[PDB]
Amino acid sequence: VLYVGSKTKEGVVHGVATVAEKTKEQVTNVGGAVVTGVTAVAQKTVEGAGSIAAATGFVKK
Amino acid sequence: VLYVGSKTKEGVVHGVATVAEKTKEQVTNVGGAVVTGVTAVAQKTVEGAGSIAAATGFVKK
Amino acid sequence: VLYVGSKTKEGVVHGVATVAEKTKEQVTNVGGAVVTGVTAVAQKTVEGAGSIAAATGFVKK
Amino acid sequence: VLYVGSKTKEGVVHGVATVAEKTKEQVTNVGGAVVTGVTAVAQKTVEGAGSIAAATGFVKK
Amino acid sequence: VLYVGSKTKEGVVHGVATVAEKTKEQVTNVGGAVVTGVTAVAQKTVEGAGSIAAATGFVKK
Amino acid sequence: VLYVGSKTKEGVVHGVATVAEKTKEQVTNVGGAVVTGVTAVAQKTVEGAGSIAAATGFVKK
Numbered sequence: 292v293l294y295v296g297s298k299t300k301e302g303v304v305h306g307v308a309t310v311a312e313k314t315k316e317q318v319t320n321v322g323g324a325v326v327t328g329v330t331a332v333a334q335k336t337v338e339g340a341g342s343i344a345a346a347t348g349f350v351k352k
Numbered sequence: 353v354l355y356v357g358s359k360t361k362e363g364v365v366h367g368v369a370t371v372a373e374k375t376k377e378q379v380t381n382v383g384g385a386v387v388t389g390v391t392a393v394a395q396k397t398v399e400g401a402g403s404i405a406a407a408t409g410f411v412k413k
Numbered sequence: 414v415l416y417v418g419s420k421t422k423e424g425v426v427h428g429v430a431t432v433a434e435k436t437k438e439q440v441t442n443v444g445g446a447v448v449t450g451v452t453a454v455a456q457k458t459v460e461g462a463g464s465i466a467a468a469t470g471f472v473k474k
Numbered sequence: 475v476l477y478v479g480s481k482t483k484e485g486v487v488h489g490v491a492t493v494a495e496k497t498k499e500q501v502t503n504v505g506g507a508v509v510t511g512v513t514a515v516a517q518k519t520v521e522g523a524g525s526i527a528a529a530t531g532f533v534k535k
Numbered sequence: 536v537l538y539v540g541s542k543t544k545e546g547v548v549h550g551v552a553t554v555a556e557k558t559k560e561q562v563t564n565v566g567g568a569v570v571t572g573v574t575a576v577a578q579k580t581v582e583g584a585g586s587i588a589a590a591t592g593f594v595k596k
Numbered sequence: 597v598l599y600v601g602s603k604t605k606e607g608v609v610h611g612v613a614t615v616a617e618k619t620k621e622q623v624t625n626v627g628g629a630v631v632t633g634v635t636a637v638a639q640k641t642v643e644g645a646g647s648i649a650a651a652t653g654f655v656k657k
């Protein structure tokens with residue numbers, strides 16, 4: 292019934308330096324799911340599912 | 353019934369420096385889902401699902 | 414019943430520097446979904462689903 | 475007496491991403507020399523001295 | 536009397552990502568030389584002295 | 597009398613990622629030389645002295 296927060300950080304990404312030197316990147320997808328190259332991502336979810344890099348193949352019935 | 357927040361950060365990305373030197377990038381998708389190259393992303397969701405880089409193959413019935 | 418927020422940040426991206434030197438980028442999609450190259454994105458959602466880079470293959474019935 | 479150069483690079487800076495988040499920067503100089511904050515600099519000198527960030531105090535006689 | 540160079544690199548800086556989060560930077564110089572914060576610098580010198588970040592106090596006589 | 601160089605690199609810096617989180621940096625110089633914070637520097641010198649980060653106190657006579 293009383294929250295007192297100072298300099299609070301929830302779901303934060305800071306101070307990031309990345310270098311990527313690639314000569315050839317290739318992705319070949321046939322019918323499925325592919326998630327590649329996710330960087331510097333942050334989030335906060337209240338009463339819900341929280342996903343960042345989720346690959347689901349498929350949903351058959 | 354009483355929140356007192358000072359300098360609060362929820363779902364934040366800051367201070368990011370990225371370099372990408374690629375000679376050839378190629379994506380070939382046939383019927384599925386592909387998510388590539390997601391950087392410096394932030395969000396906040398209240399009573400809902402929160403997804404950033406989600407690839408779902410398909411939904412068959 | 415009483416919120417007192419000072420310098421609050423929710424779903425924020427700041428201070429970002431990116432360089433991309435590519436010689437050839439190619440995407441070939443046949444019937445599916447492709448999401449490539451998402452950077453410096455931020456949002457906030459209240460009572461709803463929040464998606465940033467979501468590729469869904471298809472919805473069959 | 476014969477040079478054949480292809481894709482030659484001399485004194486080159488490329489593909490650089492920098493971020494600087496400072497709250498207070500202060501310089502106080504009394505009688506001398508100060509060089510601060512030099513980034514992404516390139517040069518080429520033929521028959522001459524080549525200096526980038528040189529601070530000389532003074533020259534007395 | 537015959538040079539054949541292909542994809543030659545002399546004095547080159549590439550693919551660099553830097554982040555600097557400082558709260559307070561302060562320089563106080565009284566009579567001397569100060570060189571601070573030199574990044575991503577490249578050069579080439581032929582028949583000459585080559586200096587990047589040189590601080591000389593002073594030259595008395 | 598015959599040089600044949602392919603993909604030659606002399607004095608090169610590449611693929612560098614640095615992060616510096618400092619709360620307080622302070623330099624106090626009285627009469628001398630100070631060189632601080634040199635990163636990602638490259639050079640090539642022919643018939644000459646090559647110095648990167650040189651601090652000389654002073655030259656008295």
Ligand SMILES: Cc1cc2nc(/C=C/c3ccc(O)c(Br)c3)sc2cc1N(C)CCOCCF
Nearest residue numbers: 294295296297299355356357360398399459460
């Ligand atoms: C959207 C929202 C956001 C939100 N953020 C808060 C405090 C963060 C904090 C509080 C205290 C602290 O000390 C610190 Br640090 C941080 S309360 C709050 C309430 C709400 N709503 C109105 C919910 C309505 O639901 C919609 C129905 F579907």
Ligand SMILES: Cc1cc2nc(/C=C/c3ccc(O)c(Br)c3)sc2cc1N(C)CCOCCF
Nearest residue numbers: 520521538539540543581582599600601602604
């Ligand atoms: C400036 C210069 C630069 C230079 N760079 C060369 C080859 C690099 C290389 C050669 C062969 C290789 O296989 C490779 Br890898 C790399 S020759 C050359 C000659 C000269 N001059 C004209 C000298 C004139 O002097 C001025 C008098 F003060």
